[PDB]
Amino acid sequence: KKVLLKVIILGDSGVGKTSLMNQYVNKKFSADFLTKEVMVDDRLVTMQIWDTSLGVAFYRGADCCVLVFDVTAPNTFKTLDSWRDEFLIQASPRDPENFPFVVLGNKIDLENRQVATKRAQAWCYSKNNIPYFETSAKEAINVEQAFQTIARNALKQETEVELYNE
Template identity: 70%
Template sequence: MSGTRKKALLKVIILGDSGVGKTSLMNQYVNRRFSNQYKATIGADFLTRDVNIDDRTVTLQIWDTAGQERFQSLGVAFYRGADCCVLAFDVTNAASFKSLDSWRDEFLIQARYVFELLK
C-alpha cells in the first residue's frame, strides 16, 4: 500500500514588484533556463516541479504573479489556497526591497481571511 500514497501538492506564490525577476526565478528553478528579455506577466502564470521530501514526492505548483499595480487586484485571487509565498526583490532597487513588507502583509491578510472562512 505504501506505493499508492497520494502525492502532495503545495501551492507557492512568488510576490514582489514589477521587474524584480519573479518569472526568471520561477523559470530558472523549474526549467533551469534564464532569459535576459523582460516580458511583463499579465495576471498570473504557474509551473510545476516535483521534489522529494522524506521519501515522498511533493508537487510544487509555483505561481508567478503580476507585480504591476494595475494587476494587483487580480493577484489577490491567486493567494487563495497558497501554502506559502516567496518574496522577491531586485538588489539594485531599494524601493523593491521596501515594498516587501506590503507584499508580506497582503499575503498574510489574504491567508488569514481564507483560514477564517474554513473554520
C-alpha cells in the same frame, strides 16, 4: 492521495520573479503557473508555482508565499512589508506569525549591490525568522537551494492543513 503544494511569488515588477521560476523549473534564463516534482527528504511532492487583483481564493490556497526583491534596487526591498501585509490580508492565515514566507534577495551577480545582506537578514529575522536566500536567477546561484527550502516549508504548511483539516 498525492501531495500538491501551491506556491506564489510576490514582489515588485523587474526584481526577477519570472526568471527565478524559469531557472528553477527549466534551468533556462531569458495568472499562470509551472509545476515541478521534487523530493523532500524521502517524500515526493509536486510544487505548483504561480507567477504574479487575482481574487482572495488565489491567495488562500497558498502553502508558501515567496517575496522577492532586487539587491541593487533599495526601493524593491522597501516594499516587502507591503507585499507581506497584503498577502496576510488576502490569505487570512490562521497562524500569521508562523505562515511560511521565504525572502529572496535576487541579482547578486550585479557586484554593485545597494542593499546589505545584514539589513535584509535583520528584516527577515524580525518577522519571526523568515528564511532568507540571496540568489542570481541569471547565473543560477542558490536557486535550487532556495526552492528546496520553499518546498520543505510549503510541505510543512500543507501537512498542517491536511492533518487538522484546516
